UniProtKB/Swiss-Prot annotation:
Protein's cellular compartments: Cytoplasm; Nucleus; Cell membrane; Cell junction, Focal adhesion
Tree of life domain: Eukaryota
Whole-protein residues included: 75 to 359 of 556
Chain residues that bind ATP: S18, F19, S20, K37, S86, Y87, A88, E92, E135, D149
Descriptive protein name: 3-phosphoinositide-dependent protein kinase 1
Transmembrane segments: none
Organism expressing this protein natively: Homo sapiens (Human)
Modified residues (N6-acetyllysine): K221
Name of encoding gene: PDPK1
Length: 276
């Protein structure tokens, strides 16, 4: 039953990383489009990434939620590993943030809520993403989110992700917890509303300075209830972010006033607000 490269008509490159290329592919027998992640074995071995690639495949096998990529299949030839992933027709969330500048309140609320549910599911399984960002939050043809890129993930019984979204505890204890994803969630909300990430600067080092000093500002037009929520996520003490277990988990966070009108139980059956 293993699939093979010949079973597909490969098309355009969707994305490139240091250790992988994601290519759109149309399976011949079915007409189905998959986003196939291709990784060269030699380069993985050379750079000691075997544990990272193994962990990524293992974590993805365990994801069975409409808000996360799905691993349909894997195979390999002599030089390469192939992971068959769900194809997110409408691409990165980042693209929409730039096209429209910033989201109105209805949109921010709806998409934030979906990210929260996704995180609730993910953290429920003791998995931490460690690199959450609009680049990693994809939109499929229905405009529901699909979170991907699990090569940096950690399974709870070393790293640093993208500078703008790195939490203080990572720059301090070199540590990482569910809270780290929640910090990143705080930045993404800020970004949906403001149009830009909260911590900006000329280089990695300057960005890290602002992060540890909690140096950022809210624009005046920022939705008040959204601001309050952000202030309860962008908290230096990881032990005091809305959503973390020390703060008693996702119940209080979902009960936040910003999510007042949200029906949490069937988000992926709701039709997303039109993005304008
Ligand atoms: C605008 O419409 C074009 C569609 O663009 C895309 C569709 C995707 N559809 C699906 C993915 C998927 N399952 N995984 C990853 N990815 C990135 C790291 N590791 C995995 C990436 C994509 C992916 C990336 C894409 O461009 C950035």
């Amino acid at each position: 039953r293993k699939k093979r490269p010949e079973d597909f008509k490969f098309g355009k490159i969707l994305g490139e990383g240091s250790f992988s290329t994601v290519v759109l592919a149309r399976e011949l027998a079915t007409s189905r489009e998959y986003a196939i992640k291709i990784l060269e074995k030699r380069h993985i071995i050379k750079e000691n990434k075997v544990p990272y690639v193994t962990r990524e495949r293992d974590v993805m096998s365990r994801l069975d939620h409409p808000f996360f990529v799905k691993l349909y299949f894997t195979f390999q030839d002599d030089e390469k590993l192939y992971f068959g992933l769900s194809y997110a027709k409408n691409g990165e969330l980042l693209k929409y943030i730039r096209k429209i500048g910033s989201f109105d309140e209805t949109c921010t609320r709806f998409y934030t809520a979906e990210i929260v549910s996704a995180l609730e599911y993910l953290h429920g399984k003791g998995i931490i993403h460690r690199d959450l960002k609009p680049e990693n939050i994809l939109l499929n043809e229905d405009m529901h989110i699909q979170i991907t890129d699990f090569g940096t993930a950690k399974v709870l019984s070393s790293f640093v992700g993208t500078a703008q979204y790195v939490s203080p505890e990572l720059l301090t204890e070199k540590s990482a917890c569910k809270s780290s994803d929640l910090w990143a969630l705080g930045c993404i909300i800020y970004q949906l509303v403001a149009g830009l990430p909260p911590f900006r600067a000329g280089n990695e080092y300057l960005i890290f300075q602002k992060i540890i000093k909690l140096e950022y500002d809210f624009p005046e037009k920022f939705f008040p209830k959204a601001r309050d929520l952000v202030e309860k996520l962008l908290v230096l003490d990881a032990t005091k972010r809305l959503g973390c277990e020390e703060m008693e988990g996702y119940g209080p966070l979902k009960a936040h006033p910003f999510f007042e009108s949200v029906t949490w139980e069937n988000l992926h059956q709701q039709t997303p607000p039109k993005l304008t």
